[PDB]
Design a protein around this ligand. Structure first.
Ligand SMILES: Cc1nc(C)n2nc(CCc3nc(N4CCCC4)nn3C)nc2c1C
Ligand SMILES: [Mg+2]
Ligand SMILES: [Zn+2]
Length: 314
């Protein structure tokens, strides 16, 4: 009850910044997450014994793939934590509680393959969930873990608060399907510019939380250049394994997934920073001004990729 989680001084200070890296020591990731729920939500948000058991069941249900792993989960929750702490008063007690859990859970039981590969392989999950295949699976895994005995961290919510938090988490996890991002951001763009955007409109909050989710999910483009560059190696290690598997099914993969196109990674990052990342953090900064450092960091990492193409490297 009187039990504060603390971190060493360099972490205590640097965790409050958008560009924090959670480091290579796996056994500290859970302490980092609990520290962020305590500071973001309060020490009374969750019963500690249930939270610890939930965290550890969540961890056990991430797989040892190069990118979509436990490290990605805690990285995406840390970005959400930075967004919530820099916009403290825009969000409900239920949103603060639900969104950090959403981020920890958002890639539960990922196998290192896109929705596309599931559909072309004809994986059972693709018959059960025709669109946002892995994302419906991720939410479904969250609900399973919440139903294990001693794991309902939401046990002290009312019946209707419980349904509202599970609904925030479901929409939050669905929005990490980058196929849904383009339309969501277009609509947020136009609503902000015509002045229609209204944070009391529940379906407007929905779109805004959806964009925050895309921002946190892509936050590897907002880190120090060495973290950005080394994560990109993990990201392509999955995409090229998928490409390999596509060729095994008799199908030319898209260039993004073809390891024969290593040479063009720099230009593919440019495309990605211009088509996805910059627009994402641009719209998020307009809507929530205190998230600007994500935009500025993204812009800095785009310059680093231009530098790689030009022969300077950094
Ligand atoms: C955080 C993050 N999240 C996602 C989903 N991605 N996706 C990428 C691939 C971008 C890409 N590469 C290529 N090819 C074309 C030929 C060689 C490379 N084309 N495109 C578009 N990078 C990221 C990052 C950094
Ligand atoms: Mg995902
Ligand atoms: Zn993700």
């Amino acid at each position: 009850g009187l039990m504060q989680f603390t971190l060493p001084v360099r972490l205590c200070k640097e965790i409050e910044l958008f560009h924090f890296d959670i480091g290579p020591f796996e056994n500290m990731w859970p302490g980092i997450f609990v520290y962020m729920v305590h500071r973001s939500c309060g020490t009374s948000c969750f019963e500690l014994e249930k939270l610890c058991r939930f965290i550890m069941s969540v961890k056990k249900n991430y797989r040892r793939v190069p990118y979509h792993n436990w490290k990605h989960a805690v990285t995406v929750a840390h970005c959400m934590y930075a967004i919530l702490q820099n916009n403290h008063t825009l969000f409900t007690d239920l949103e603060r509680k639900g969104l950090l859990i959403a981020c920890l859970c958002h890639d539960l039981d990922h196998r290192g393959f896109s929705n596309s590969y599931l559909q072309k392989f004809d994986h059972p999950l693709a018959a059960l969930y025709s669109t946002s295949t892995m994302e419906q699976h991720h939410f479904s895994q969250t609900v399973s873990i919440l139903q294990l005995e001693g794991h309902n961290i939401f046990s002290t919510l009312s019946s209707s608060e419980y349904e509202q938090v599970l609904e925030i988490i479901r929409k939050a996890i669905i929005a990490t399907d980058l196929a849904l991002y383009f339309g969501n951001r277009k609509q947020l763009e136009e609503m902000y510019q015509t002045g229609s955007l209204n944070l009391n409109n529940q379906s407007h909050r929905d779109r805004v939380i959806g964009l925050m989710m895309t921002a946190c999910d892509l936050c590897s483009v907002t880190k120090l250049w060495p973290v950005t560059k080394l994560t990109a190696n993990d990201i392509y290690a999955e995409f090229w394994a998928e490409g390999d598997e596509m060729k095994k099914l008799g199908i030319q993969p898209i260039p993004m997934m073809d390891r024969d196109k290593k040479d063009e990674v720099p230009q593919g990052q440019l495309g990605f920073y211009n088509a996805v990342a910059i627009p994402c953090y641009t719209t998020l900064t307009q809507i929530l001004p205190p998230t600007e450092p994500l935009l500025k960091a993204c812009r800095d990492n785009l310059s680093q990729w231009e530098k790689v193409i030009r022969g300077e490297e950094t």
